[PDB]
Structures are given as structure tokens and as C-alpha cells.
């Protein structure tokens with residue numbers, strides 16, 4: 030049945046949170062793979078390796094913030110497999126960039142979708158959360 | 173527009189609710205001060221929170237005046253009971269109360285839809301308080317409260333000391 | 335020599351295992367974050383260890399590239415269960431898991447026989463973790479876990495606080 | 497006929513450059529509109545207004561770099577209308593963010609497409625150019 | 640009062656006109672960048688002015704919001720031609736364009752009659768630009784432009800260098 | 802793999818080409834030094850560029866040795882003519898020559914496909930030189946060169962002075 034702390038928390042969102050959790054975990058895994066792509070002698074770009082190892086950790090940090098929110102609102106966390114990343118051709122280093130481009134847009138979009146859902150269901154708490162979480166993603170790199 | 177008088181009332185309603193909660197936690201605190209109860213950190217916990225709720229209410233009054241509204245004060249009702257029976261009970265009631273106060277608080281937001289969004293910060297705070305009280309209820313239960321006086325003793329020390 | 339492709343695979347295998355353990359302890363942690371469990375130091379303990387296992391995996395990836403191998407990533411399987419039932423259970427599972435991970439890790443060493451002996455330090459570390467989890471299981475049991483919620487409460491404080 | 501400076505410059509690219517020119521000009525115009533959205537008293541976020549006015553100018557700066565490249569290689573510049581931006585609902589300030597999200601991805605993607613084209617046509621000069629131009633777009637905000 | 644919507648439109652109209660001019664001078668500049676033209680100071684001159692016109696337009700947008708109006712953006716039309724044939728031509732067109740833009744700009748003032756008189760400074764600036772372009776046309780003509788490529792060469796250096 | 806001997810030859814080929822261009826611009830320069838020509842800034846311009854091309858060639862030799870190749874030197878052919886007739890001609894020839902040298906240079910890149918991508922910087926530089934010479938041809942033509950000695954005089958001063 031229902032957790033004692035649950036208020037105004039729709040079950041659709043509980044499910045969408047869980048979806049975004051796995052997605053950020055996926056994004057973490059992808060960045061991680063991208064990092065060690067640039068680490069190999071065949072490539073040997075230490076700057077990029079530095080960057081994506083940082084991006085990987087931030088995504089996982091973002092994932093755990095979602096998890097903390099779930100338990101906070103009363104929802105329940107169901108973890109799924111973290112799929113090995115599907116971007117194949119890293120021969121050019123630009124295809125790797127293209128991978129991240131689609132990954133970012135996807136991750137950011139689901140957040141936006143998660144926000145419309147939050148607005149539909151009249152949950153102000155969840156709306157404030159996503160906005161922050163989102164602006165941090167896009168605008169965290171600046172100030 | 174009924175909006176201005178709808179909100180000015182929803183504010184006045186929320187003001188009396190936060191004052192109510194203030195009174196409630198005030199009662200709870202001194203329940204743990206009495207010598208047949210004698211849990212000092214339960215007492216501290218609620219007196220602190222009682223002051224939190226009072227601060228919230230004063231902020232809402234400053235808001236009303238900021239927005240040009242008029243403050244209509246209502247009586248502050250004595251809380252349901254003066255004997256709270258146990259720490260787990262008092263936590264359980266507070267869990268209930270915060271959820272009910274959060275209810276109207278939410279109603280307050282959906283009706284406003286400000287550019288200013290002033291009270292959203294206190295709305296974020298209530299959700300922390302809720303998760304905490306649930307956390308606290310959960311722990312007292314698994315420890316054997318209310319019937320085990322030891323459990324509440326060790327909780328007063330180990331959880332509510334730090 | 336199959337050796338280079340045998341090791342490059344044993345590495346790729348160990349990488350996915352450490353990532354797996356990372357996922358496992360991550361799940362365990364937030365199990366203790368939920369309000370029907372509410373053990374903060376159990377949660378901290380596993381989140382820390384989850385990060386340890388992730389660090390281990392990244393090191394193994396840097397090794398693979400150092401040795402000229404190729405990293406073949408595999409899916410990270412969801413852990414066996416999402417409800418760990420109790421602190422003693424979660425410790426017991428982790429004890430099992432570290433022993434299984436240590437198994438292949440050992441296989442990894444006997445197959446290498448390097449001059450460099452790189453991973454021997456992390457091999458030494460797993461044996462500390464094993465003795466610790468055993469120590470932790472042992473203590474929760476003698477205290478009356480899982481069925482005594484008090485035991486796990488006092489363990490969360492006195493053992494996992496310091 | 498042919499400009500005296502033209503070498504290894506395919507006509508497909510000449511056309512794709514011209515397409516990306518108008519696109520960055522469009523992106524400039526969009527950011528410009530987004531800026532003064534946050535400038536109005538109804539909204540009044542000076543930080544965001546500051547940011548998009550900066551992003552607008554950078555996009556136009558990017559456009560002119562493409563123009564300078566065209567003339568450099570021998571191609572010819574054909575300007576098209578800069579379409580007024582089509583994102584309608586700015587009531588939420590998150591829909592404005594969503595606008596930029598799609599705009600960035602679009603702009604960045606055409607660059608990537610322009611790079612594949614450059615690789616197909618064996619133009620190393622144009623490949624180096626886009627890569628830089630692209631990394632500047634994505635990774636300029638950091639270092 | 641149609642006044643508020645008359646002005647808010649006259650502003651929106653002027654905004655698109657200054658953006659148009661910005662586009663025009665932008666086109667003119669890179670016309671002189673191409674290798675079959677190759678006049679660098681003609682190119683500089685117009686790119687600068689193109690930025691001037693853009694600055695003007697952004698100022699008008701800040702005005703609209705200041706006055707509580709709403710900004711209605713319209714497409715920015717490609718300029719009449721992409722090949723400007725000569726420096727004297729491009730000057731001649733710009734002379735025409737500034738006079739036309741000045742026309743509506745004037746209309747904008749007579750309709751406002753502010754106490755604030757905000758745009759009067761940019762109105763004073765256009766009249767300088769007009770006298771300058773006329774000065775520039777005049778000089779290229781007496782030198783033998785467009786047909787004399789030398790004239791435009793020496794003008795690009797001696798007039799548009801300093 | 803023919804690759805190593807294909808590239809080592811494409812390098813040796815490019816080396817002789819850059820040396821050739823060096824010789825060419827060297828000839829052009831002192832053509833403008835002679836007293837029946839007497840354009841000092843044309844002379845400076847080409848002597849500078851002649852040194853640029855020589856620098857390029859030495860860099861390519863350092864590359865060959867870096868990559869383990871062997872440098873096979875060939876004769877440096879006298880340039881096509883010793884009398885360049887005019888500044889516009891000499892610019893026109895140089896435009897042709899850089900385009901031809903750029904041709905093989907491109908061939909050099911598509912055949913390499915390095916991780917190191919060493920010569921890409923000099924490839925970027927040739928494209929600037931090409932646009933410049935075109936710019937220079939264009940300007941001399943519109944001024945009335947070659948037949949107008951004044952045009953080339955004023956170009957030597959105003960364009961090739963600064």
C-alpha cells in the first residue's frame with residue numbers, strides 16, 4: 030500500500046522518476062566509456078578524458094539526487110539494467126561527440142517531459158525540483 | 173476578480189494553520205518536560221519546531237501586507253489533546269498535522285501562480301519535515317515503542333541528541 | 335598467445351563485476367534511505383562502498399588501456415532484488431558478493447603473473463572488506479537481528495557512526 | 497564560372513555553408529528574442545537576459561566566421577530571410593529553455609552533417625574548420 | 640487610446656527596420672571580402688555600421704519593454720541583392736536606405752511626443768551618417784568610380800583607412 | 802604495406818615542391834630588385850614568402866626523420882622563367898603555383914590519415930596565402946595593371962607597404 034510520507038505524488042511521476050534514474054545512470058555509463066576512449070594511446074587526448082570522467086561522475090551524482098527525491102516523496106525505487114552504450118563507430122572522434130549530443134538532448138528532454146507531467150499533476154514541489162535539476166544540467170557549466 | 177480576495181483569504185487561512193501547528197508543538201514539548209515523562213530531547217525537538225512554525229506564520233503575515241491584502245486573524249484553537257501519551261504518538265500526530273497543513277499550503281500555491289513564487293521555499297521545507305517525521309516514526313516502531321520505555325529513552329538520546 | 339586475449343578478457347570481466355557491485359551497494363544504500371527503513375548510517379556505509387567499487391572499476395579500465403588491450407563493455411545488470419529486508423540481510427549479501435568478486439579477482443591474478451603486479455593492492459583491500467563484513471554480520475546476529483529492530487538501530491549508531 | 501581561389505571545394509559544401517549561415521543567423525535571432533523575454537517586467541530575470549544577449553552575439557559571430565570561410569575558399573554567399581522565431585508559448589520560462597534545447601541540437605547537428613559531407617568530399621581544410629567551430633560551440637563554455 | 644498600440648507598433652516596425660539595415664550592411668561587407676572584389680576597408684566600414692544598426696535595434700527592444708509594450712518580431716528579409724557591383728553602388732544604396740529608415744524614425748518621433756524623448760540621440764546620429772555617405776558618394780564619383788577600379792582602390796585606402 | 806613507402810615518397814615529393822616554390826619566390830624577388838623594375842615592396846613580399854616556403858620544407862624533413870623515413874633529395878629545378886614581366890604576372894604565377902603545391906599537399910593528407918595530423922597547420926596556412934594572392938591579383942587588375950606602371954607603383958606602396 031501507501032508510504033506514510035506520500036502527498037500529492039502521482040504514480041505517473043513515481044514511474045517517470047524511475048525512468049530518469051536509469052537514464053542518468055545510462056548517461057553516466059556512456060560518458061565513462063567515452064572517457065576511456067580518449068585515454069587509449071590510439072587517441073591520447075588527456076583533456077577530453079579528464080572532461081568526460083568528470084561528466085560521468087556528475088551524471089551519477091544527478092541520478093542519486095533523483096533517488097533521494099523518490100524516497101523523500103514516498104515513491105519506491107526500482108532499478109533496471111544499465112545498458113552498455115550503443116554508439117558503435119568511434120574511429121572519428123567526432124562520432125563520439127555526436128553520441129554525447131544525442132545523449133544530452135535525450136536526457137534533458139525527458140526532464141522537460143517530466144516537468145510537463147509535474148505541471149499537469151499540480152505538484153509544485155516536483156516542478157521546482159526539475160527546473161533546478163535542469164538548469165544545473167544546462168547552465169551549471171557557466172555560473 | 174475573486175482572485176485577490178480568494179488568495180488574501182487562503183493566506184489568512186494558512187496563517188492560522190501555521191500558528192495552530194506552533195501551538196501544537198508547544199504543547200507537545202512541555203508534555204515531555206513533565207516529570208512523569210521526562211524526555212528532554214523530545215521536548216527540545218518540538219519547541220524548536222514550534223518556533224519554526226511561528227516564524228513561518230510571521231512570514232505569511234509580512235506577505236499579506238506586501239501584497240496589499242488585509243490580515244484577518246482567527247482564534248488559535250487549543251490542540252486536540254493535552255496528554256500525548258508517548259513519543260511515538262506525538263511524532264505520529266505531527267506527521268499527520270504536517271501533511272494536513274501541507275495540503276492547504278499546496279492549495280495556496282496552485283491558486284497563486286505568481287511570478288514572485290514567494291512561499292515555494294517553505295513548501296520545499298515541509299517536505300523535508302515530513303520525510304523526517306516518517307523516518308522518526310519508523311525508527312521508534314521498530315524499536316518497540318510505545319510500550320517499551322527503553323526504546324523511547326534510547327531514541328531521545330541517540331537520535332534526538334545529534 | 336591466447337594470454338593477451340585471455341587477460342584482456344579477464345580484465346573486461348572484472349570491470350563489469352566491480353561495476354555490478356557498485357550498482358548493488360547503490361541499491362542497498364537507498365533501501366536504507368526510504369522512510370520505512372530509515373537507517374542513515376547503513377545508507378552512508380553502502381554509498382561509500384559503492385563509490386569504492388566504482389573507483390576500482392575505473393582503475394581497471396585505465397589498466398586495460400595501459401596494457402594495450404581493448405575495453406569491451408557489457409550491460410550492468412540490475413541487482414538480484416530491490417528490497418533487502420534488513421540490515422543484517424544486506425550485510426550478508428554483500429559478504430557473499432565480495433567473496434564471489436574476489437573469486438574472479440583471484441583468477442585474474444594467477445593468470446597474469448606480471449612483473450608489474452598492479453592490482454595486488456586492490457586484492458589486499460578486498461580481504462579487509464571481507465573480514466569487516468563478517469565482523470558486521472557477526473555482531474548484528476548476536477544482537478538479535480533481523481527480528482529485533484532495536485539491534486539494527488543500535489548498530490547503525492554505535493558501529494556505523496564511528 | 498569559377499573563382500580563381502577555388503580548390504577542392506565541392507559545390508555541395510558551398511551550399512551547406514550557406515545553409516548553416518542562415519541557421520546561425522536564425523539562432524542569433526532566436527536568442528535575441530529570448531533575451532528580451534527575460535527583460536520584461538512580467539519576467540524580470542536579468543541574469544538570463546544577460547546570458548542570451550551574449551549567446552545571440554556569439555551565434556552571429558559564428559555566422560560571420562562561416563561567411564569569411566565561404567569567401568576564403570571561393571564559394572559565394574547567398575543570404576536568405578532570417579525567419580522570425582517560431583517558438584510560441586512563453587508563459588512558462590521552461591518552454592523557452594526547451595526552445596533553445598532544440599535550437600542548439602539542430603545547429604550542432606547540421607555542423608556534424610556538414611562534417612560528414614566534408615569527409616565524403618575529401619576536404620581536409622573544411623574538416624578541421626568544422627571540428628574547431630563545433631568544439632567551440634559545445635566546449636567553449638568550459639575551457 | 641490607440642496611442643499605446645500605435646506607438647508599440649511603430650516601435651516594432653522600427654525594430655525590424657534597424658535589423659534589416661544590419662542585415663544589409665552585413666551583406667555589403669562580405670561582398671567586399673570576396674576575392675573578386677577585395678576591398679578590406681570597405682568591408683570593415685560596413686561590418687562596423689552593421690553592428691551599429693544591430694545595437695540600435697536592441698536598444699529599441701529594451702525601450703519597448705521599458706514602456707510596457709510587447710515586442711512582435713517579424714522576419715528579417717534578405718536584402719534586395721547579393722551582388723553590390725561596386726563600392727560607389729553600395730554607398731549609394733546605403734544612402735538610400737538610411738534615408739528611408741530615417742523616414743519612419745521621424746514618424747516614430749512625431750507620434751511619440753514624450754517627456755522622456757529617448758530615441759532623439761539615435762535620430763541625431765542618423766543625420767551624421769547621412770551626411771557622411773553623401774560625402775562618400777560625392778568623392779567616389781568625382782574620382783571616376785565605378786568604372787575606374789583605381790579610384791575605389793585609393794578611396795578604400797585614403798578615406799576608409801583613417 | 803606500401804603505405805610507409807607511399808607516404809615516405811609523398812613526403813619526399815612535397816619537400817622538393819616547397820623547395821621549388823622557395824626558389825621561385827626568390828627569383829621573383831630579385832626580379833623586382835633590378836633597376837629596370839625597382840619595386841622594393843614587391844621584392845620584400847616575395848623574399849619573405851620565399852623564406853616561408855623554405856621553413857615549410859625544413860619542417861617536412863624533420864617530419865620524415867621523425868617517422869623513421871628516409872629523405873631522398875632531388876634537384877631543385879630553376880623556375881620556368883627569369884623575367885616575370887610585371888607585378889601582376891608574378892602574383893598570377895604565384896597564385897597558380899600555390900594551387901598546384903596545395904594539390905599534392907592535399908594528396909599528402911588523404912593518404913596519411915594520422916592520429917598526429919602534423920601538417921594540417923601548414924595546410925590551413927596555404928589557403929590563407931591563396932585567398933591573399935587572389936585578393937592581390939584582383940586589385941592590380943582593377944587598377945589597370947600590367948600596362949599601367951602607376952597602378953603597380955601605388956600597389957607596391959599602399960598594399961605592400963602595410
Ligand SMILES: [Ca+2]
Nearest residue numbers: 087166169170
Ligand atoms: Ca554538467
Ligand SMILES: [Ca+2]
Nearest residue numbers: 190225228273
Ligand atoms: Ca508549517
Ligand SMILES: [Ca+2]
Nearest residue numbers: 352387390435
Ligand atoms: Ca571490489
Ligand SMILES: [Ca+2]
Nearest residue numbers: 554633636637
Ligand atoms: Ca556558446
Ligand SMILES: [Ca+2]
Nearest residue numbers: 657692695740
Ligand atoms: Ca539606423
Ligand SMILES: [Ca+2]
Nearest residue numbers: 819854857902
Ligand atoms: Ca607551400
